[PDB]
Ligand SMILES: *[C@@H]1O[C@H](CO)[C@@H](O)[C@H](O)[C@H]1NC(C)=O
């Protein structure tokens with residue numbers, strides 16, 4: 001048995017074809033982000049849009065080279 | 066002139082085929098039988114020991130006939146199999 | 151072409167004419183727009199058609215007005231389609247939509263309370279940044295030493311990626327001190343005051359960390375720097391193309 | 396170049412029907428002759444863009460069914476109309492012109508879901524573009540459910556008046572000549588699949604021994620409708636067809652070829668083999684592609700069949716060895732548009748053409764030879780026409796070939812095989828006796 005909550009979403013690929021009986025499935029690589037973000041961040045931004053809010057948090061990151 | 070060719074087209078008679086395509090397999094088999102019932106005599110003649118001139122004569126005289134019959138069976142069979150002419 | 155957002159309450163447009171007139175003298179056709187008076191929104195896209203080629207977001211004070219006018223998910227899609235952007239900020243003006251958009255790019259501005267200050271300064275009254283802090287030659291290269299005037303600026307942290315283009319820096323001594331007991335946003339030379347960004351499609355954003363940089367009352371000290379930064383921002387100073395490979 | 400002003404349009408009403416995947420313009424004009432020597436000419440003006448793609452241009456009097464000698468010429472461009480009888484210096488005569496373009500409006504949103512309806516955008520000229528001074532003019536659009544404009548003009552006079560089934564325009568009392576300063580752009584609803592055949596080549600194999608004429612066609616089909624956003628997803632497709640939503644969707648699922656009267660031995664083939672989803676009923680061949688052709692997808696396939704030859708040939712009257720053949724020029728899906736047509740007729744091994752006539756002006760005609768099964772010398776005689784712009788159901792003509800086929804070359808076909816068999820036997824003889 002398979003439940004719809006099992007399979008996680010696919011963030012780096014996007015489906016472009018699948019046969020009548022779902023036998024052969026053809027996916028395509030997504031083009032890398034224009035702004036330089038990791039596509040997982042784009043995914044989490046598009047699936048979690050309204051509730052994912054944080055007031056203020058100083059980001060922790062390495063000193064700019 | 067398109068008008069006069071189109072006038073001549075309808076006026077004329079239709080096309081009557083030489084040998085209908087429904088009775089060509091019959092001729093195909095009845096010619097396939099004959100074209101081998103004769104071409105075996107050719108090989109028997111050439112194999113048989115006799116005068117060279119007589120062998121040549123009794124080979125070509127009944128080889129031309131087998132040639133014609135095979136060249137007329139290979140059209141009826143080709144039409145009957147679905148690859149016309 | 152260019153669109154010009156502003157807010158009369160926070161900062162009147164009458165103190166920015168000198169530069170916008172300089173734009174009107176270079177064939178730019180810019181339509182002014184208010185933030186509250188116009189209840190009807192503005193349309194950047196109609197059926198996948200970019201209307202404007204440039205955007206200038208003068209200081210605002212957050213609110214639901216800006217958030218209605220241009221949300222993040224629309225501004226990203228506009229900037230991605232070769233749309234240049236200029237953007238300003240200050241500890242008196244930190245729009246939430248601007249902050250979230252810049253955070254999505256990689257630039258992190260300061261929050262409302264935090265303000266930069268430097269005790270080692272020739273003029274105590276306001277911030278004077280020396281022309282030795284220029285970090286990128288193609289944007290602006292100082293022919294002669296000068297002093298850019300800033301007032302109540304707000305430095306920004308930068309991530310480590312290949313698109314961000316630091317243009318100015320803050321003096322090493324300076325530091326951001328907030329009213330409350332919050333940790334200093336940026337300490338030392340790690341805090342940048344003017345920061346560009348170049349998309350992979352050759353779109354260009356420029357964030358200026360002070361509302362007092364472009365005011366017409368300051369045009370004797372930082373005239374040429376502003377007139378070159380506004381050229382670089384609108385893709386008309388350093389553009390390269392390869393003809394035959 | 397401007398034609399000598401000689402006529403005056405005393406009425407000019409034009410109607411454009413956008414209902415069948417190609418613009419079909421119909422202009423009804425009453426015309427008066429300027430007082431001068433009786434002239435017999437007329438120059439209709441097409442824009443240089445539209446004139447590049449026009450596939451049919453007819454013109455006839457309202458009173459008389461018969462047509463005129465309408466012809467195209469060879470930056471406004473012109474088409475020539477010429478009257479049978481010279482018009483009087485001062486006379487009034489009605490006339491009707493029908494043109495069939497090959498350009499349809501581009502999808503406006505361009506990205507629609509597979510269940511939404513698509514809207515198309517078309518750019519034409521509002522004020523009539525004529526080579527003479529026009530007195531009264533009216534414009535009308537028909538054939539769609541809903542019309543809307545796009546960047547409407549401020550002036551009220553230049554604004555369309557909506558109607559229940561049509562979109563008319565107010566008559567203009569005085570229009571000067573060569574006025575093309577207003578580029579109207581209009582969007583309209585349209586749910587057809589917008590087929591387009593980028594390349595068609597159809598072969599017609601005559602054969603007198605078997606007395607059968609067999610057709611073989613190779614379609615390269617492209618859908619021009621709005622592409623689908625978010626990419627393909629079989630789940631949505633197979634969940635929407637189970638509900639009654641397959642009314643007029645804009646993707647191709649089944650094509651309906653219309654063959655001649657009695658066809659046999661139908662086949663439908665693809666580049667990667669045989670397609671099994673075909674169905675041949677009476678006078679209709681239904682075809683299901685491998686995948687549904689959404690917007691922007693290409694499908695290249697082949698379809699063939701066979702007919703009795705007695706319906707297309709006719710032996711002449713004076714002699715029994717002069718034949719006249721009337722080959723149909725197009726029979727495909729109901730409403731497509733062909734961007735190139737290559738019509739090849741393969742007359743038998745020893746034919747010899749005497750006359751060639753076509754009812755639609757072709758671009759190129761040539762004669763070669765091509766060898767086929769049991770063609771042991773010079774093969775068949777191939778006669779190929781090349782047409783450029785053709786419509787599916789209004790470019791209905793018949794190419795008339797007139798050739799001869801003497802019995803001295805009808806019976807050479809068995810003899811040319813008898814020669815090989817006899818040579819092989821006479822070679823085996825020498826090889827075995829030496
Ligand atoms: C709204 O805009 C007007 C523009 O003149 C300004 O004067 C006013 O202060 C603004 N009100 C706000 C931002 O609440």
Ligand SMILES: *[C@@H]1O[C@H](CO)[C@@H](O)[C@H](O)[C@H]1NC(C)=O
Pocket residue numbers: 759760761
């Ligand atoms: C017409 O077809 C012939 C035959 O191949 C070719 O030689 C000639 O160049 C063609 N002309 C045009 C204008 O297409």
